[PDB]
Ligand binder design. Structure first.
Ligand SMILES: C/C=C1/C[N@@+]2(C)[C@H]3C[C@@H]1[C@@](CO)(C(=O)OC)[C@@H]2Cc1c3n(C)c2c(OC)cccc12
Lengths: 119, 121
């Protein structure tokens, strides 16, 4: 769910997930994927691409189990798509932390971006 | 792909990428991950971990056109999935060069299985 995803971005970056990434660029947030503005936006771009190949569960409501070992996000086996769902959030949570130096506030708030290419 | 990534390794390290990093340690290779045997192995370990973040990026489309300008890899592909794939290949090529001093040919080909299980990325 958004609880797990938010906890991941918070545990990775230490930042407010809804404040920093609730409406960042043209991929972080709602309304699908658009032409990314930076690397942080590219993370949410791949994140929603990671959601398209998800079948058997809704990424926004279905709660899953993960742990925090050795300062790493460790997904619980749970169910195949739920595991793939957990990996999508973990991937972008790691991705946003690794591009946190490229973060610019001018993109913190977003149909003005070009149509997204196929994943 | 392997062609672009191989080209990057040779341009940074000056070594035949298949000979030196085709089956080195537990993570250098086109197969899988394991416990890093040394620094050069972590380059490949991080490389594989970099790959796992790309799930959803069309596995068939791995060809891209990076640039070798002023002796630096430059990923300029518009496709973000190709952009991040290029950066995954770029990062390991740099890492493989930085850890050339600690390169051990003993790990180059692993005859007996000696790989522990890979810790989570
Ligand atoms: C982007 C397209 C790709 C197509 N392919 C076959 C490439 C890169 C990525 C990847 C990585 O997971 C993928 O499916 O990402 C969505 C897969 C799996 C993969 C690739 N290499 C070059 C790999 C590699 O070389 C050292 C070693 C192990 C796995 C892969």
């Amino acid at each position: 769910s958004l609880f797990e995803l938010g906890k991941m971005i918070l545990q990775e970056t230490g930042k407010n997930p809804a404040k920093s990434y609730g409406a960042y660029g043209c991929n972080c947030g709602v309304l699908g994927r658009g032409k990314p503005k930076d690397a942080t936006d590219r993370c949410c771009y791949v994140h929603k691409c990671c959601y398209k190949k998800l079948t058997g569960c809704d990424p926004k409501k279905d709660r899953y189990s993960y742990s925090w070992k050795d300062k790493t996000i460790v997904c619980g086996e749970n169910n195949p798509c739920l595991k793939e769902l957990c990996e999508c959030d973990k991937a972008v949570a790691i991705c946003l932390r690794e591009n946190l130096g490229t973060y610019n506030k001018k993109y913190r708030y977003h149909p003005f971006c070009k149509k997204a290419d196929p994943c």
